[PDB]
Amino acid sequence: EEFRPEMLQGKKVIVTGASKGIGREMAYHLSKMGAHVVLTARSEEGLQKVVSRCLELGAASAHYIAGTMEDMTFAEQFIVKAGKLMGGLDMLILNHITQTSLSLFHDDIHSVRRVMEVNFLSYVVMSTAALPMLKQSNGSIAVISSLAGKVTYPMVAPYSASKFALDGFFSTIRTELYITKVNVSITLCVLGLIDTETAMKEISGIINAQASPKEECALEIIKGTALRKSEVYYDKSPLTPILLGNPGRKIMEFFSLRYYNKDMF
Amino acid sequence: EFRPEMLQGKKVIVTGASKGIGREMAYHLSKMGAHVVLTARSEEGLQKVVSRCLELGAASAHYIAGTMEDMTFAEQFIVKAGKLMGGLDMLILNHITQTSLSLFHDDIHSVRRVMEVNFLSYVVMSTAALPMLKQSNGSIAVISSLAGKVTYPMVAPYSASKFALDGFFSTIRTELYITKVNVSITLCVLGLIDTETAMKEISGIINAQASPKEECALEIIKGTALRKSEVYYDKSPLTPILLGNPGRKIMEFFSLRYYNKDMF
Numbered sequence: 001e002e003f004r005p006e007m008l009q010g011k012k013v014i015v016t017g018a019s020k021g022i023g024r025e026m027a028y029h030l031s032k033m034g035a036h037v038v039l040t041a042r043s044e045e046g047l048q049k050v051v052s053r054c055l056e057l058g059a060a061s062a063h064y065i066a067g068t069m070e071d072m073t074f075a076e077q078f079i080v081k082a083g084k085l086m087g088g089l090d091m092l093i094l095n096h097i098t099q100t101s102l103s104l105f106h107d108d109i110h111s112v113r114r115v116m117e118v119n120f121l122s123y124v125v126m127s128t129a130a131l132p133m134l135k136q137s138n139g140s141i142a143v144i145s146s147l148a149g150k151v152t153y154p155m156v157a158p159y160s161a162s163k164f165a166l167d168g169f170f171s172t173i174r175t176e177l178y179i180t181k182v183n184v185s186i187t188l189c190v191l192g193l194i195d196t197e198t199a200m201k202e203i204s205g206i207i208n209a210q211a212s213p214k215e216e217c218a219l220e221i222i223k224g225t226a227l228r229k230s231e232v233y234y235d236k237s238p239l240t241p242i243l244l245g246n247p248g249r250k251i252m253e254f255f256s257l258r259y260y261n262k263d264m265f
Numbered sequence: 266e267f268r269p270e271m272l273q274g275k276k277v278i279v280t281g282a283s284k285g286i287g288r289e290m291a292y293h294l295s296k297m298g299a300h301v302v303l304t305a306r307s308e309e310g311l312q313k314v315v316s317r318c319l320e321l322g323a324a325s326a327h328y329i330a331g332t333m334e335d336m337t338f339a340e341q342f343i344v345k346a347g348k349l350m351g352g353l354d355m356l357i358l359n360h361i362t363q364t365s366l367s368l369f370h371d372d373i374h375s376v377r378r379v380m381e382v383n384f385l386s387y388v389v390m391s392t393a394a395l396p397m398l399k400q401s402n403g404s405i406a407v408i409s410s411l412a413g414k415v416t417y418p419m420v421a422p423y424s425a426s427k428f429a430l431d432g433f434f435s436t437i438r439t440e441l442y443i444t445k446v447n448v449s450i451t452l453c454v455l456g457l458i459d460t461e462t463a464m465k466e467i468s469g470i471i472n473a474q475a476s477p478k479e480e481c482a483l484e485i486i487k488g489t490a491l492r493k494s495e496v497y498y499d500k501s502p503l504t505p506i507l508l509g510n511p512g513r514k515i516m517e518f519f520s521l522r523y524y525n526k527d528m529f
C-alpha cells in the first residue's frame with residue numbers, strides 16, 4: 001500500500017496542540033491536501049494565525065477551539081463541538097502535551113499528576129468521546145509518542161510514565177478493536193528528537209543530540225495514520241526501529257489470544 | 266546467591282498484605298524474622314495477618330489501615346510506619362485496585378482511580394520513603410505484571426498503570442545510578458498467580474495455568490534482597506527470553522553519553 005494525498009482530501013480531521021511545533025506542521029500538510037480541520041491549543045491568538053494560514057493553504061474548512069487539556073470537561077466538549085462543526089470525524093491526531101523541563105526527579109508529585117492528566121488522561125477522554133464518530137467512518141487515531149515511551153532516559157520520569165501509559169492503553173484498545181472486527185485504526189508514532197523550538201530550548205545545555213526536521217516528521221505521522229499502520233518510527237538513526245522492534249512482545253501478543261474464550265468477541 | 270538470614274531484623278513495609286501475594290510475602294518475611302508493617306483498607310484482615318505473622322516468628326508486626334486512593338494517607342503511612350519500626354530497609358509496592366476483565370467501556374473517573382491506586386500512590390510512597398532507604402541503603406520492590414511489558418485485551422486501564430510503573434521507576438533507577446545513590450529498584454514482572462481474586466476474575470474467560478502464590482512471594486523477596494533490576498516469574502520458561510528486550514538495554518546504556526556530565 002502507498003500513500004496518496006487524495007486520501008485526506010475532504011476528510012474531517014482533528015489536531016490537538018495545533019498552535020505550534022509538529023501539530024502546526026500537521027495542520028498545514030492536511031490543509032494542503034484539502035481536508036477539513038478543527039484545531040486546538042491554549043493560545044487563542046496562536047490558533048487564529050494557524051487557522052488563517054490553513055485557509056490560504058487550501059483547507060476545505062478550518063476552525064479553532066481554545067482551552068487547556070488539563071480540564072477533562074473541556075477535552076470531552078471539544079470533541080463534541082469539533083464533530084458538530086465538520087458533521088463527522090475521520091481522523092483524530094492526539095499530539096498535545098503539557099510543558100516539561102529536563103531535571104532529575106526530586107520530590108515532584110503534584111507535577112506528576114498534572115503530566116498524567118494532560119499527556120495521558122485527556123487522550124483517553126478524547127478517544128472515548130470520538131470513537132462513535134470514527135466507528136461510523138471507519139476512521140483512525142494518531143497517538144503521538146516518543147523514544148521515551150518505549151525506552152527510558154534520565155531527567156524525564158513523569159513524561160516517560162505518561163507516554164508508556166499511552167503504549168499500554170492504546171495498544172490494548174487497538175487489539176480489542178481488531179478482535180471485535182471494529183474497523184478503526186490506532187497508530188503509535190514513536191518519535192526521536194525533533195527540531196521544534198520548545199524541544200531545542202529544553203535540550204539546550206543538557207543534551208547533545210541531533211534533531212530531525214519537524215515538517216518531514218509531521219508528514220510521516222499523517223502518512224502512517226492514513227495507511228493504518230500500528231506503529232510509525234521517526235528518528236535520525238536507522239538503528240532505532242530495529243532496536244525498538246521487540247519481536248518477543250509481538251510473538252507474545254499473537255499467541256496469547258488463544259488463551260481467550262472467543263465467545264467474548 | 267540469596268540467603269534468608271539476610272532479611273533477619275530488617276524493616277519491611279508490605280502494601281496490599283491483607284490477602285493475595287502481599288499476605289504471603291508478609292508470612293515469608295515473618296518466617297525470616299523481619300520487622301514488618303502491613304497495610305490495606307480492611308482493618309480486620311490486617312489484624313488476622315499480623316497475628317499470624319507474630320506466630321510465624323516476626324521480629325515485630327504492625328498495621329495501618331487505609332485507602333491508597335488517598336495520597337495524604339499514602340504519604341503519612343510511610344512516616345508512621347517508619348517511626349513504628351524506627352527505620353526502613355525494604356519497600357514492597359504491591360497493592361492494586363480490583364480488576365475485572367472487560368472490553369474497555371469505563372468513564373474517566375474509573376480510569377483515574379486505577380492510575381491513582383496502581384501508579385500515583387507508588388510514586389508518593391517511594392518518594393516519601395526514599396530518605397530512609399538512602400539512610401539504610403534499602404530497596405524498593407515495584408510489583409508489575411506481564412500486562413506491564415505486553416498488551417493483553419480486556420485489561421486496558423490495568424496495563425496503562427503497569428506500563429506507567431515501568432516508565433517511571435526504570436527512570437528513577439538510572440537517576441539513582443548516575444547520582445551514586447545506593448538504593449535498588451526491582452521491577453517484578455509476574456505471570457498468572459493462583460490468588461482468589463485472579464482466579465475468580467479469569468473464570469469463564471481465560472483458560473491458562475496459574476503459578477503458586479507462595480513461591481511467587483519468595484522469588485519477589487529473593488530478587489529485591491539481591492538488588493536485581495527485574496525479576497521475571499511465569500509458568501512458561503520461554504517468558505523471560507521473550508520479554509528480555511536487549512535493544513532497550515543497549516539503547517539506555519549508549520544514550521547516557523548524550524548528557525552533560527556536569528548535570529550530575
Ligand SMILES: NC(=O)C1=CN([C@@H]2O[C@H](COP(=O)(O)OP(=O)(O)OC[C@H]3O[C@@H](n4cnc5c(N)ncnc54)[C@H](OP(=O)(O)O)[C@@H]3O)[C@@H](O)[C@H]2O)C=CC1
Pocket residue numbers: 016017018019020021022023040041042043046067068069070095096097098099118144145146147191192193194195196197198199200
Ligand atoms: N519535539 C520533540 O523533541 C519530540 C516530540 N515528541 C512528541 O511530539 C508531540 C509534539 O511535540 P512538540 O511539537 O515538540 O511540542 P511543542 O511544545 O512544540 O507544541 C506542543 C503543543 O501543545 C500545546 N499545548 C501545551 N500545553 C497544552 C495544554 N495545557 N492543553 C492543550 N494544548 C497544550 C501547545 O500550544 P499552547 O501552549 O498554545 O497551548 C503546542 O501547540 C508531543 O506529544 C511530544 O511528546 C516526541 C519526541 C520528541
Ligand SMILES: NC(=O)C1=CN([C@@H]2O[C@H](COP(=O)(O)OP(=O)(O)OC[C@H]3O[C@@H](n4cnc5c(N)ncnc54)[C@H](OP(=O)(O)O)[C@@H]3O)[C@@H](O)[C@H]2O)C=CC1
Pocket residue numbers: 280281282283284285286287304305306307308310331332333334358359360361362363382408409410411455456457458459460461462463
Ligand atoms: N494474581 C495474579 O494473577 C497477578 C498479580 N499480579 C500483581 O501482584 C500484585 C498483587 O496481586 P494479588 O495479590 O492477586 O491482588 P489481590 O486482590 O489478591 O490483593 C490486593 C491487595 O491490595 C489491597 N487493596 C485493594 N484495593 C486497594 C485500595 N483501593 N487501596 C489500598 N489497598 C487496596 C487489598 O486489600 P483491601 O481490599 O482490604 O484493601 C489486597 O490486600 C498486584 O500488583 C498485581 O498487579 C501480577 C500478575 C498476575
Ligand SMILES: COc1ccccc1[C@@H]1N(c2cccc(S(C)(=O)=O)c2)C(=O)C1(C)C
Pocket residue numbers: 097099100146147148153156191192193194198199202203207209523
Ligand atoms: C536525544 O533524545 C532525548 C534525550 C533525553 C531526553 C529526551 C530526549 C528526546 N525528547 C524530548 C526532548 C526535549 C523535549 C521533549 S518534549 C517537546 O516532548 O517535551 C522531548 C524525547 O522525547 C526524546 C527521548 C526523543
Ligand SMILES: COc1ccccc1[C@@H]1N(c2cccc(S(C)(=O)=O)c2)C(=O)C1(C)C
Pocket residue numbers: 259361362363364410411412417418420455456457458460462463464466467471473
Ligand atoms: C494468562 O494471563 C493473563 C491473560 C490475559 C490477561 C491477563 C492475564 C493475567 N493477569 C491478571 C488476570 C486477572 C486478575 C489480575 S489481578 C489479581 O492483578 O487483578 C491479573 C495478569 O496480570 C496476567 C497477564 C498475569
